[PDB]
Design a protein around this ligand. Structure first.
Ligand code: HDD
Ligand code: HDD
Ligand code: HDD
Lengths: 726, 726, 308, 83
């Protein structure tokens, strides 16, 4: 009986904000949050309270502290089957990690369409606005291992398993609308180039090394997704604040057999928001689990991640109406040309119970479609269809990975497939082949139809010779990079410049830097000059003369490509550091905390040690963490309430907190005497945009702060930060 | 629809004799035969009727006859995910077979004790005669692979998984009471010697080769089990008609902590019965699945295999009371010295639904004991404890093999072990370690006790140095061989002689046969001379003068070691071939079938073609098989009714039928004109013992027949069979 | 000291007729036979004479007869690493058998073309009558497991691995010129149908059961290869006396890029010969290894299998 | 067995002994060594019992455990001296 008698070992089963309670398995945290998939997992959920400790064969263990030996200092005996079972299971706990997207964080939720999409697709899950479809989503990085850091610069995966009434549909996308290469045959070359180098296995979680930029310099098709990765897109604030995309053109097929080309989108209802590089990189050290943690705690708090599914739709007759090929996954479809039509909403509202069992074993694969969808000849998508089935044979130990509970369909599955390693299903069918008469030919094929029909591929015409040949329509590499560049704000552009400069600076062979610079000179000369200056490289007159690539279908920009050009701020679920002192002005804290609560913004109360401090009026303030324990990297803004500022004015950590927050462009608010900190960050007496200051935290102080928070960062501060030593 | 109109594709769900209906999975044949384990498999049992054919992901298939291709004569397309999933699962169906005992046949049943054994054991499944324990039993050969034949000369395995309330207990036995070797460390040597030789992988299912007899000749400890294998013990008639033994001394432990030495026995209630060598060998060609088929069909017929569990019990103070060591697994405990106490009955009453899922994947391990039992220092048993856990890691794919349905305890199992390939259980425990406070230390250890207690080892005293050394008390090799030899009937002795003779004639290196004959002369000179004579070897003067080994604790013999010395014949479930003609005397057949039914003996009606024949009075007689299709190898006796005997009297296959049955010592009955067949098998006009004959098949004729069938075979016929060319 | 004085434990390293000597591993039986593949396998061959017995880590073993225990009648100790390494390797000896054609017998050999076929194919191994290409050939049945009988009625496989100077070419044939079914999608259905039935795993090595004839009766495309299987083709006397076929039309491509359709054949130079059914069936019982034995003994005798 | 795929892990190049290794162990997944020994067991006469056990001794001897005295009952118990 080792639990504390006060029951404080057990987190409350009610929504609680980040840091308030220990985190728990989703079914213990939020037992009343249900969906059909979560319910269907009950057959395999294993409890523990009130149960005897046993071997796996059900035998009660008396002494789980000792091996069986001859004498209490004697040798361990081979007949200790209890020891050997327990050590054997431990010795085999690991399975191979995913070849790519090894690092991922996942949650349960549901999806519902806004209205029936029957006119354009017979997919059952999109047929009725009252049809709720359970989902399991895993977000990920790409390059690093399962034990690598979350806030690296990388593409992010966004994979959604829809447990539909007519089968599993996996929408396996990323946080940018394109991919680096055109044809799946090159995927191991590209991935090998970005992954740690094979002699020494360095670097982890980074493209900032020779082989990646070598490959990019020799394969200009890469440049478009490289632009995305070098922008602040490569370092999202949270999985809740990035976009998702299927990348490829797929098809919707309706009941009448009409095909429409579609590209899939996820819009984050919490808005788009990213870190800045120095912050992101430092955060991989102070909290390598920041995104995993932030996702988990948002869900425990009730700030459920929500996304709107949208479709770019293109009629068949319009296949050839763009300057780029629809089947080229290095090309995006600009929303100015083809708008995203809202389809439905996905809400992630429960964490898993066991990460290994639900997250690590989950298998997503874009070939898992359902009637009412179909593929295209996109030669990247075509090769993906082969890989995601093949890879599970080692990763999940054989062909029965669909019987792993997280992977099971919630709808019926019956066929003539048998055996394989780990077979769970016990088939009673007299027949394991068809056609058969001995079971009256059951289970039976189903003709295609408007609903509940069998899958039939769209009868697309194929005409050509058998060739290993790239379509000439795919041979244009620069105009999409340029459209992306021209769509970014000036501060975004500067961050792109710095991302290339920083990465190429880690490339040891200078000629590779030079070749990358030359490629940039084919995209935009301003970009290329700015990166060249940072690398001490001088463009040639030839380079200064390269003619830019054409506009994309007459577009000189599209603001939907920018994180920030069109305001979409949402403060709910964000967090503020509050820097306490040993005699806080309690009226300030009351005003601050209640203002934050009313807008769904969380607070963490920080000090120079753990335990408690006491306010002017005697209110006892619980300390969440120390200045060093919970650095400004982990919050969206910082508030210093008034009180005995002398307590902390000389504290190096307290000062550095504000300097780090300041450098990374975060809103800072200072009440009463906290304004003496103005000198630490070099603010003028009359103050500046992005620093909130007043005699107290009453009146408009909290509104001014929340306004800054809704705009995310203080971009206007950028020219100020270069000279500050932080 | 493909089934026949008349519904004759589906076997009746009621007990039916062998051959009357097509065989079926157990839950469809016998859906109301229930036990707790069978019921608990319902979560994984998968039906088929009235379901749509789907992928494993739940997507309905429209056309299960064709690949997706560009044009009806075009190439197959990579995007055909239906084809690839179906082919992938196929391509991965096989798992490694068991290292040994790969060939085996299994069934569900239950065990129930005859009385409470709590005076001698706290094992919960033996605490009360109303305690019903579900079992799953797998019988097997040893040497051959999963695709080898049943009726080889080999040891047979007899493995019983007891699903108890306090844990899985696996009693992993064989059909002889000893093993070939003394120390687990030599197991790979002996098994490599007996298995197919490494250069060419010959022979399958046979010890009749150089390397086995080389090892035997150099390791005299093997000779006792080799005597067993060379006897008719090596070639059982049925898994229903052989004994089972745990071989090793184990311990029972009671509530007071008192230990009693125990050896386990299974006594077959259908009695003991074996084939003869020529019959067994020929049967591996005519029906390599004979034992598997016979077991499945007995259960289908209601002839449930039944066995009494028996204990030989030796008080701990009696450890040194014998002239052999109780821990030596090459020594048996004669029942004349220590009787078998009959303790309970096991009944095998339902076949599996899917052979691969339930039988092939079942894992039995003698280290799976429950409180109330314990091990001993037997150095063969000691090493077993290591192997049966270790082997499953490759065989069943990882450390979660207890989650494979057939292996699951039906009692609770909870502990802190996590992950591993194909993890099914999703743990909700906040803690995955103990001691822990965060889950109040649950699941918790349990002190040992009289019932529902944790497992504690019997605190046996260990004194000695760390040595790789065989106990001197194991160093006697001939006295147990001799006791077994002296306990056999004279015809059992002749068959042992012929076993050795036949096997040694297949040893190519003559010095090996000579060296084996030398070992026989250390057991018994009569045996050694008779084998030497068959091999064209003459014993030396030195060999004639080898003193026989001593009696075993004064025992001149022990009749419990013979299959036949003491009558235990049971005819229920045996089978008789009835050889039809195109005008059978219907009155004969009425009386035969009636008398057979009365004793639960089955019949197969045989002819020269399939279809039907018509009796003298118009009865339509359906033909089960041809003479060549269902050879006398497959039946216990042959009856020839009267009728138009001219029809068959010139049929070579009919005459050979009777020659073969006669050679193999089977009862033959001939009524009225069927006595013309006497001449093909050389029966004197006056008749002979084992040929039943009369004017018609009246009442005395069947009693005669059935009395012979109760004595199994006509051993007195042996001197006559040397003359018959068959 | 264990071998006999007269050296009769060791087979003569020279061609001997079946039954004259015990059989032995190829490199010991016929150490003078060589080809380029066999030479290249030398880096992995391990001998045995005059070497100490060791663990897999190279530690010499003193006593390979006993486990380490506390007293000579005592319990076995967990620290016995020699026992656990040896038992662990034994525990994990088996690997999954082939889904189909699990039962099969194999030999090393060589191939040589009669003349250059450069006019119709640029395949290097067919370019020069002097070019000799090593092979490895495995013959098999189709239905039964690796431990099933040789002289069953079944299709036989005849698979040839050609180790050419421009890559491995595998010609993966059967002993009839067609197959039972038209489209690969149905392979698991047909193979499930002929394989032992799933409730009880019977029958081994035999198409003589309900599910096979159900599938055939419902799928007439199967009758052609069924005729062959039901003929004496389905019970060959020896792997040496059967034909082989690639079954499918493939292409030859010459240096000009001209494609020619091609079907592959193997002709047995020992001619064509089959058992009769009663003989074949009984023989599965009297010697289930008859074909594997006959192939190995032909090669030891110098009756080398030859195929055109 | 799981991490490296089976019991031939000593054949993965990095793991191989540079000294002789010979024994009667056979097969396993990804078996590299092709054994030519007529025998895969001992004792064997067919290869004159080779490879052979080696007595322990000063150098190049077989492995023999130190014959430490063991005295105690079969217990799952922490030595009091560890407390
Ligand atoms: C032909 C090779 C191939 C290529 C061209 C792609 N993938 Fe992929 N992908 C795999 C082969 C693969 C894989 C190796 O099979 C993975 C890793 C292990 C797994 O189960 O699937 C995988 C994982 C994987 C995951 C992680 C799923 C999870 O959370 O478990 C995501 C989100 C994507 N991919 C998304 C993409 C995108 C956006 C691509 C370009 C548009 C793309 N993949 C191309
Ligand atoms: C040290 C190794 C070792 C030793 C000395 C023994 N066994 Fe064993 N046995 C195994 C190692 C093994 C094994 C390799 O672990 C098997 C085959 C693979 C497996 O799953 O278990 C097995 C299976 C196995 C089976 C078949 C279980 C089934 O049908 O699935 C039986 C009946 C026995 N054993 C019985 C015995 C008996 C009576 C022994 C002598 C008293 C014996 N074993 C000694
Ligand atoms: C799409 C499934 C499939 C199809 C339709 C076929 N095969 Fe196959 N074959 C396999 C899938 C396979 C396999 C499952 O992959 C095997 C078993 C294990 C192995 O190594 O490959 C195999 C083995 C295998 C072997 C044994 C090779 C060996 O000794 O290792 C032969 C001789 C053939 N096949 C020949 C044929 C012929 C003549 C076919 C008809 C034209 C045929 N196969 C169709």
């Amino acid at each position: 009986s080792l639990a504390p008698e006060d029951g404080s070992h057990r987190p409350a089963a009610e929504p609680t904000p980040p840091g308030a309670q220990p985190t728990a398995p989703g079914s213990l945290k939020a037992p009343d949050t249900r969906n059909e998939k979560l319910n269907s997992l009950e057959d395999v959920r294993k409890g523990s309270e009130n149960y005897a400790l046993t071997t796996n064969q059900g035998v009660r263990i008396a002494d789980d502290q000792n091996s069986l030996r001859a004498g209490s200092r004697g040798p361990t005996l081979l007949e200790d089957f209890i020891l050997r079972e327990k050590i054997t299971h431990f010795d085999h706990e690991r399975i191979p990690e995913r070849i790519v997207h090894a690092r991922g964080s996942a949650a349960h939720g549901y999806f519902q369409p806004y209205k029936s999409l029957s006119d354009i697709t017979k997919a059952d899950f999109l047929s009725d606005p009252n049809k709720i479809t359970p989902v399991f989503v895993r977000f990920s990085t790409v390059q690093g291992g399962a034990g690598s850091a979350d806030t690296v610069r990388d593409i992010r995966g966004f994979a959604t398993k829809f447990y539909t009434e007519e089968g599993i549909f996996d929408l396996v996308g990323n946080n940018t609308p394109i991919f680096f290469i055109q044809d799946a045959h090159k995927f191991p070359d590209f991935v090998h180039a970005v992954k740690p180098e094979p002699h020494w296995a360095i670097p982890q979680g980074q493209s900032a090394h020779d082989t990646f930029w070598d490959y990019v310099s020799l394969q200009p098709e890469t440049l478009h997704n490289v632009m995305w990765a070098m922008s602040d897109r490569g370092i999202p604030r949270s999985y809740r604040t990035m976009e998702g995309f299927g990348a490829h053109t797929f098809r919707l097929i309706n009941a009448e057999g009409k095909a429409t080309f579609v590209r899939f989108h996820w819009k984050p209802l919490a808005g788009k928001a990213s870190l800045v590089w120095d912050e992101a990189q430092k955060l991989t050290g102070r909290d390598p689990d920041f995104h995993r943690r932030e996702l988990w705690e948002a869900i425990e708090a009730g700030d459920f991640p929500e996304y709107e599914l949208g479709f770019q739709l293109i009629p068949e007759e319009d296949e050839f109406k763009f300057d780029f090929d629809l089947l080229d996954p290095t090309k995006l479809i600009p929303e100015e040309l083809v708008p995203v039509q809202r389809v439905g909403k996905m809400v992630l509202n429960r964490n898993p119970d066991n990460f290994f069992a639900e997250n690590e074993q989950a298998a997503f694969h874009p070939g898992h479609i359902v009637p009412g969808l179909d593929f295209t000849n996109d030669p990247l998508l075509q090769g993906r269809l082969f890989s995601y089935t093949d890879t599970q044979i080692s990763r999940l130990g054989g062909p029965n990975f669909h019987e792993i509970p997280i992977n099971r369909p919630t709808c019926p599955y019956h066929n003539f497939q048998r055996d394989g390693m780990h077979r769970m299903g016990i088939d009673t069918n007299p027949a394991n082949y068809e056609p058969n008469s001995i079971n009256d030919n059951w289970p039976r094929e189903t003709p295609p139809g408007p609903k509940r029909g069998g899958f039939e591929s769209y009868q697309e015409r194929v005409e050509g010779n058998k060739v290993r040949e790239r379509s000439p329509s795919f041979g244009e590499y620069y105009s999409h990079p340029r459209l992306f560049w021209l769509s970014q704000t000036p501060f975004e552009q500067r961050h792109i410049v710095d991302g290339f400069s920083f990465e190429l600076s880690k490339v040891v062979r200078p000629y590779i830097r030079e070749r990358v610079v030359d490629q940039l000179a084919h995209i935009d000369l301003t970009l290329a000059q700015a990166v060249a200056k940072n690398l001490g490289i001088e463009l040639t007159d030839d380079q200064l003369n390269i003619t830019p690539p054409p506009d994309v279908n007459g577009l000189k920009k599209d603001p939907s490509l920018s994180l920030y050009a069109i305001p979409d701020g949402d403060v709910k679920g964000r967090v503020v550091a509050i820097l306490l002192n040993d005699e806080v002005r309690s009226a300030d804290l009351l005003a601050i905390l209640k203002a934050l609560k009313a807008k769904g913004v969380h607070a963490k109360l920080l000090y120079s040690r753990m335990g408690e401090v006491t306010a002017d009026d005697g209110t006892v303030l619980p300390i969440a963490a120390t200045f060093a324990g919970a650095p400004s990297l982990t919050v969206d803004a910082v508030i210093v309430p008034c009180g005995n500022i002398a307590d902390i004015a000389d504290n190096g950590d307290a000062n550095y907190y504000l300097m780090e927050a300041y450098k990374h462009l975060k809103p800072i608010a200072l009440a009463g005497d906290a304004r003496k900190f103005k000198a630490t960050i070099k603010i003028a007496d009359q103050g500046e945009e992005g620093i909130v200051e007043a005699d107290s935290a009453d009146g408009s102080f909290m509104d001014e702060l929340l306004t800054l928070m809704a705009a995310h960062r203080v971009w206007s501060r950028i020219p100020k930060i270069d000279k500050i030593p932080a």
